[PDB]
Amino acid sequence: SKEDDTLRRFRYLLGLTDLFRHFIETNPNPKIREIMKEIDRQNEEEARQRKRGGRQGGATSERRRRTEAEEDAELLKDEKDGGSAETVFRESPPFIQGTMRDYQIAGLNWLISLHENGISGILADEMGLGKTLQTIAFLGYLRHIMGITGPHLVTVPKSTLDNWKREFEKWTPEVNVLVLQGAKEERHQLINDRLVDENFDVCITSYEMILREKAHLKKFAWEYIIIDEASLAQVIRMFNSRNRLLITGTPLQNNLHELWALLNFLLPDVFGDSEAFDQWFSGQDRDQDTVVQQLHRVLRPFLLRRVKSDVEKSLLPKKEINVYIGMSEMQVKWYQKILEKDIDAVNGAGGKRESKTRLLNIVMQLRKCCNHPYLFEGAEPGPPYTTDEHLIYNAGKMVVLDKLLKRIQKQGSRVLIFSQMSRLLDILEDYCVFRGYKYCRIDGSTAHEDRIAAIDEYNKPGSDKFIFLLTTRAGGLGINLTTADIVILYDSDWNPQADLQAMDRAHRIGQTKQVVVYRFVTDNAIEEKVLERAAQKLRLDQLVIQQGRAQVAAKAAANKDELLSMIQHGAEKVFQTKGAFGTMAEKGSQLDDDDIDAILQAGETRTKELNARYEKLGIDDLQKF
Numbered sequence: 001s002k003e004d005d006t007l008r009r010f011r012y013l014l015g016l017t018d019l020f021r022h023f024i025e026t027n028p029n030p031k032i033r034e035i036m037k038e039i040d041r042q043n044e045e046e047a048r049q050r051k052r053g054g055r056q057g058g059a060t061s062e063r064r065r066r067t068e069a070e071e072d073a074e075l076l077k078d079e080k081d082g083g084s085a086e087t088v089f090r091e092s093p094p095f096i097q098g099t100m101r102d103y104q105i106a107g108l109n110w111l112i113s114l115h116e117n118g119i120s121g122i123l124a125d126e127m128g129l130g131k132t133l134q135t136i137a138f139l140g141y142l143r144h145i146m147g148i149t150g151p152h153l154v155t156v157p158k159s160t161l162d163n164w165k166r167e168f169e170k171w172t173p174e175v176n177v178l179v180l181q182g183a184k185e186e187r188h189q190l191i192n193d194r195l196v197d198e199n200f201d202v203c204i205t206s207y208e209m210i211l212r213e214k215a216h217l218k219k220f221a222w223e224y225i226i227i228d229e230a231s232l233a234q235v236i237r238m239f240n241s242r243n244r245l246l247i248t249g250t251p252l253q254n255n256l257h258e259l260w261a262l263l264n265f266l267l268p269d270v271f272g273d274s275e276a277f278d279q280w281f282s283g284q285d286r287d288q289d290t291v292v293q294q295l296h297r298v299l300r301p302f303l304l305r306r307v308k309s310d311v312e313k314s315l316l317p318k319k320e321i322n323v324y325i326g327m328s329e330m331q332v333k334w335y336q337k338i339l340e341k342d343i344d345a346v347n348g349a350g351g352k353r354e355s356k357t358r359l360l361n362i363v364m365q366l367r368k369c370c371n372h373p374y375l376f377e378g379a380e381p382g383p384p385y386t387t388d389e390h391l392i393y394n395a396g397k398m399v400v401l402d403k404l405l406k407r408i409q410k411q412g413s414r415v416l417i418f419s420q421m422s423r424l425l426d427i428l429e430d431y432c433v434f435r436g437y438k439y440c441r442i443d444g445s446t447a448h449e450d451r452i453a454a455i456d457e458y459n460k461p462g463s464d465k466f467i468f469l470l471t472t473r474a475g476g477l478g479i480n481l482t483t484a485d486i487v488i489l490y491d492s493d494w495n496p497q498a499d500l501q502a503m504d505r506a507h508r509i510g511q512t513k514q515v516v517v518y519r520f521v522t523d524n525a526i527e528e529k530v531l532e533r534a535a536q537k538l539r540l541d542q543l544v545i546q547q548g549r550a551q552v553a554a555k556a557a558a559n560k561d562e563l564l565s566m567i568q569h570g571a572e573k574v575f576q577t578k579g580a581f582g583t584m585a586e587k588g589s590q591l592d593d594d595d596i597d598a599i600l601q602a603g604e605t606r607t608k609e610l611n612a613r614y615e616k617l618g619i620d621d622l623q624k625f
């Protein structure tokens with residue numbers, strides 16, 4: 001759905017300063033204006049039904065905190081869908097017939113992240129970091145996970161044509177590749193049975209053949225158009241594509257026109273014409289070199305670049321630690337109240353015929369309780385609401401957090417704190433002020449939140465900032481927070497890949513320290529159960545990887561080693577034999593049927609034995625073969 005693509009894209013852009021908002025708000029295209037008006041009026045209504053922060057000791061900031069009802073509806077809706085949809089690979093994917101390096105897996109995950117945010121990107125790794133494999137893995141992700149096979153268009157210099165062809169063939173043989181080359185007669189032989197027929201998943205083309213066949217290429221609604229190393233943009237602009245990838249080996253350059261050309265390539269609906277950009281530049285008040293630098297900063301989320309030294313340096317493994325935590329007396333009371341108000345379902349003695357929605361609501365409330373009792377209306381000590389030390393002691397997690405942060409600051413470390421609930425971050429904001437903690441905050445809002453400003457404030461050398469408060473969703477916005485070295489998951493995502501994505505905001509190339517992750521778990525309550533399920537799904541996930549990779553090898557034609565072991569099997573005993581082999585030498589002619597009844601009996605017995613040998617095994621015992 002391209003209409004939901006636009007929305008997801010626009011919503012992602014609005015946090016990257018007001019630059020994109022401006023080009024959308026004032027966009028020449030009326031249709032573009034409409035969508036922006038829509039998200040605006042929606043943001044207006046949500047602002048009407050929100051307040052700015054009660055607590056007297058509290059945060060003074062201007063964002064508007066959500067209603068208990070409003071966030072309950074979102075958590076519920078989210079629970080109906082098993083959590084975020086995020087995909088994050090922990091290892092080289094089974095569909096890649098080979099092994100990716102750690103930094104290539106990270107590249108893959110970054111490309112995936114762009115795709116799920118509906119944005120195009122630039123892979124600008126230094127030559128030799130295997131950008132081809134990374135791109136191919138990403139297209140493999142589209143195929144095997146998202147059910148998208150193509151059609152994709154890959155345009156390359158003539159010299160690289162053979163390499164792209166081989167790598168597709170090597171890493172993902174199942175992908176149907178069509179290469180456009182040759183004279184005018186060598187083409188029509190391909191076009192009839194292949195090109196015009198859409199008998200391909202991927203079309204690899206030289207820059208040349210793009211022009212000479214543009215008429216046929218324009219007929220397709222392309223998924224991805226990928227340009228390797230970049231009148232090229234003129235023809236590409238006139239192509240239909242859901243997304244694009246630019247593959248280059250060079251960093252961004254201080255050239256205003258090039259930067260506009262990238263923005264136009266990445267966002268052709270937002271930056272459609274050169275004229276609107278020139279008018280924007282002449283109308284604004286920063287000099288050219290400053291604008292150039294602002295454009296670089298804005299292009300950062302759409303660009304991945306790593307140089308050999310980044311890759312050759314070691315990225316320390318993360319220490320992940322679960323923190324098992326009790327509940328305050330107040331938590332105990334509210335937990336009981338929640339369980340009791342639906343005691344029939346909790347006991348589970350009846351029909352269990354109530355809706356799933358009824359059970360989801362319960363789970364949601366228990367989740368809120370394990371977080372902080374103040375999330376419930378009427379729970380916090382009645383008016384006036386103030387940040388006491390009671391704000392800490394009424395929650396088991398707050399008590400542990402409070403001492404943990406104290407110890408984190410002493411050793412001179414900096415911390416990211418993620419949560420599923422914005423209304424919980426609100427409580428954390430107030431707590432931060434009460435302890436005099438300097439902080440930034442990002443929720444992934446489209447209501448005039450500037451995440452570039454906040455990221456930069458946190459990342460500046462000698463920054464005053466200590467804590468960064470973040471929704472777990474914000475972890476999927478491709479942000480870089482390597483200046484922090486400790487991560488606290490205040491509560492967990494039902495999709496472990498979402499939390500992993502969050503940890504990776506700090507645990508990624510550029511990080512110099514050992515990333516320590518603390519996952520708060522309310523012991524002997526609902527959260528510990530979720531924790532076990534998470535570990536089960538992780539093991540299941542590992543098996544399907546381990547097995548799926550063996551399937552690929554099994555499904556495939558024989559190895560030279562496999563062939564050789566076939567040839568050699570029994571070869572000795574054959575060479576040794578001078579007469580006839582065992583069964584034939586025992587007699588020779590058409591002898592006793594008792595020999596036949598024996599052979600059939602021996603055969604039936606050996607058969608049961610050969611089956612039984614493997615029917616019991618699992619893959620690890622199967623690998624011994």
Ligand SMILES: [Cl-]
Pocket residue numbers: 125126127128129130131132
């Ligand atoms: Cl490369």
